[PDB]
């Protein structure tokens, strides 16, 4: 698990995200889609975005960045006590959306990348360690639900 001090660092970092949830969410999705174009292909509603300028111009991509990061934020504020937020979220993602656990790795790494890009010098080593652990916990608990469901 994470220590109390590690959770406090995660939720301190998340305050940066909450000052501009839509711009963080947009930049995280853009980082995901440009670095791993197979992930774009999973979004019928974003498949038409062929360039980064089109992605940056998409108000609906910003909207979904908000939806994604609001969900993750609520889960992180549970400090690991997230079985209910997570279980039905893992079922949607495995069964409705058909999203390999690899893509949650990719988006974890995108979150770390975006935090450094928007907060250079203000996202230190302890904060990065703690955030990375929190995001590993999130995807590991999804992965357990994926194994139950045989999506593996």
Curated annotation (Swiss-Prot):
The modification Phosphoserine is found at residue 3. PROSITE patterns: GLOBIN (PS01033). GO terms for molecular function: heme binding; metal ion binding; nitrite reductase activity; oxygen binding; oxygen carrier activity; peroxidase activity. One of its GO terms (biological process) is oxygen transport. CDD domains: Mb. It holds the Pfam family Globin. It catalyses: Fe(III)-heme b-[protein] + nitric oxide + H2O = Fe(II)-heme b-[protein] + nitrite + 2 H(+); H2O2 + AH2 = A + 2 H2O. GO terms for cellular component: sarcoplasm. It is an enzyme of class 1 (oxidoreductase). Heme b binds at residue 93. It is found in: Cytoplasm, Sarcoplasm. Its EC number is 1.7.-.-, 1.11.1.-. Keywords: Cytoplasm, Heme, Iron, Metal-binding, Muscle protein, Oxidoreductase, Oxygen transport, Phosphoprotein, Transport. O2 binds at residue 64. Monomeric. This is Myoglobin. It comes from Equus caballus. The gene is MB.
């Amino acid at each position: 698990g994470l220590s109390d001090g590690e959770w406090q660092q995660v939720l301190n970092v998340w305050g940066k995200v909450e000052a501009d949830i839509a711009g963080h969410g947009q930049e995280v999705l853009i980082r995901l889609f440009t670095g791993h174009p197979e992930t774009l292909e999973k979004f019928d509603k974003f498949k038409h975005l062929k360039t980064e300028a089109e992605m940056k111009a998409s108000e609906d991509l910003k909207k979904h960045g908000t939806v994604v990061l609001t969900a993750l934020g609520g889960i992180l504020k549970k400090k690991g006590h997230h079985e209910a937020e997570l279980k039905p979220l893992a079922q949607s993602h495995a069964t409705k959306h058909k999203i390999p656990i690899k893509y949650l790795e990719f988006i974890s790494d995108a979150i770390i990348h975006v935090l450094h890009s928007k907060h250079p010098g203000d996202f230190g080593a302890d904060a990065q360690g703690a955030m990375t652990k929190a995001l590993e916990l999130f995807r590991n608990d999804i992965a357990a639900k994926y194994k139950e469901l045989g999506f593996q």
